[PDB]
Design a binder for this molecule. Structure first.
Ligand SMILES: [Fe+3]
Ligand SMILES: [Fe+3]
Ligand SMILES: [Fe+3]
Ligand SMILES: [Fe+3]
Lengths: 208, 208, 208, 208
């Protein structure tokens, strides 16, 4: 009777030091156990309030709806985006390299080559004003692999499009190790990208 | 060799006066032939520039990337959201009423009844500060039908989630007929909602 | 004992039909008596809640602070910006023309001439994505007359800078008369600009 | 002939280790020499482009206006806000304590006491979703000392209002020392607040 489901904190796909030396375990530890866990808790605590509101246990005058709704995009996106992020990376050996399969083929057709794509993606990522993410969506309508800079966790998303590749650009994602050198972090990140994961996500929407 | 696909302007699913008296033909005409068409043109014109940039025809110093990327979320979302909007409505007789199928079942389980859902959805829609949309997403992860107010065409979306129900709240969607009476417009809109379309969208992601 | 002041609804500097034929009285009437009045009421109603919160009459758990704070930037800016807007315009005869005094001098030095300034200001105003305003600030630090497109009523402002010139670009500011032809409205607006008001605002910060 | 002025990088009002132990010199060093300097450089580089555009040296098709304008609010605000921030703090001994003068009087009248104000200001600061600032404006219109959470450097400002008190909440402002413990940083910050500077800013707008 009147009930919403809550989110679960996912498990890290590897050990906290599996991405070294590109991303120190010091960062992964707090990034995962601190920030990500916090987004799940924040989202669940706001879902409790929304649930009470829907039931009538929280009467008008005892809440400010915009505070609950905006708090949910922030926290829900924070959780979902980090969940993709962890899986979109892989330990030094398994991760990195060049893409393959349909993904490699689309990148060639739309960017000319993986090198140009890397150049354009990096340029876009460096253009992001402040904290956010840079994502690569697959547009089933046009068939384009669309690059986009996302501000915070919830601004600039293209509705319904699946994420193929993603980089976290919040300062907590690299500060302990790279400080204000975001460009250095971005160059390092390329070495731990999990192209298998990326190709798997693409295959899920190809010709569907 | 290096080429991105462009977007196509879709056809209206009915005559421009098919939603009367809830939404006058004067609004539908310019909303569709004016605004929507403009988003498709704007998106395509920006894709041309991005394509040139990728090819190298547009050299560094002859563009401002953030202007191109942010212009794209604005226009692409403007197009995609309007495309759903037209299909999410139906002529007086065909549209309106109460939902059915899996959608009606989920609404009862999470909101208690269609009447409460209507109340909560309307309350959320009326809380939107300024121009934007109010959407109902289906979260495959939690199984929740999440309500959200989207600012402009690109702020507050929850990444990757499909749109099940949607209402345009930009002033151009009702001003000619309702003026500043946004609440009156929202009450009228319920009479043209296409629940068949909504149920179809949900069925696409159920148990998948 | 613990009390915040509320905002007062200002009087229109002229009759609702004083800006015709550039801006119809139909627009001014609802724009002033409808929208502006609504921002003052919205801001005051939120100030009541914040006041109760500060006093302790509204206990934790009966409010969502972000909903109150963000609601205040929206409404307070909505009120303040419209208040400047009304005074920044003048009836056909009194308004329009070319600026004079220190303002005309600065525009010449920074834009080459009033014609170029008009061209650049119009180009910026037309580039605004969605609803908002285009403003001309006077930067006391650098001495520059900075143009800026403001999204909604509260995004993109440059902290502490005074507004010298301003155009409302929310759809309700021109829709009844120009429909989706925002560019036509912008061209018309130039005919009712109150340069005396603009020069007065500038003089207030020159050499101070 | 057609020329805009550029911004100058200000000097730190004290040594980079003058705020210890509340804010380590490691943070101040890169925060000042890295981040702040970068905002000044970013702003000036964009002003160069805008200047060229105005002169005609940068022809249409070789720039994306929104990229230039939005890049300017980001950078100009980043610079101006940091400039206030440095002056709004003072070495352990000189800074901290309780406010005095007109400021202390207004806080008592509107918040009941400095302790409540501190509680409310801290509650607001901790509610900020993501990176940004929490500011205290003085509204000459109403006479209220308005608290506000600013997202990034440019979202949520109330037009034209002067900043009286301010706290940087971008992760780079405390991560090296406090990691994700933003609340701990906010508690420490109260010990270095420069109330003399704050009172001076207020006196500038009182009865004027
Ligand atoms: Fe992160
Ligand atoms: Fe629309
Ligand atoms: Fe307006
Ligand atoms: Fe900072």
């Amino acid at each position: 009777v009147i009930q919403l489901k809550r989110y679960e904190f996912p498990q890290l796909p590897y050990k906290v030091d599996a991405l070294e030396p590109y991303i120190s375990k010091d960062i992964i530890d707090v990034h995962y156990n601190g920030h990500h866990k916090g987004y799940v808790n924040g989202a669940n605590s706001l879902l409790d309030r929304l649930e009470k509101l829907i039931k009538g246990d929280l009467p008008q005058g005892q809440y400010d709806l915009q505070g609950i709704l905006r708090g949910l995009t922030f926290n829900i996106n924070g959780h979902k985006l980090h969940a993709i992020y962890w899986n979109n990376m892989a330990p030094a050996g398994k991760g990195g390299g060049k893409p393959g399969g349909a993904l490699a083929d689309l990148i060639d057709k739309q960017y000319g080559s993986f090198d140009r794509f890397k150049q354009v993606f990096s340029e876009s990522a460096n253009s992001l004003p402040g904290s956010g993410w840079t994502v690569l969506y697959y547009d089933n309508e046009s068939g384009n692999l669309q690059i986009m800079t996302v501000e915070n966790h919830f601004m600039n998303h293209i509705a319904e499009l699946p994420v193929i590749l993603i980089v976290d650009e919040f300062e907590h994602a690299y500060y302990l190790q790279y400080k204000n050198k975001r460009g250095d972090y971005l160059n390092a990140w390329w070495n731990v990208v999990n192209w298998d994961d990326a190709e798997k996500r693409l295959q899920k929407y190809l010709n569907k």
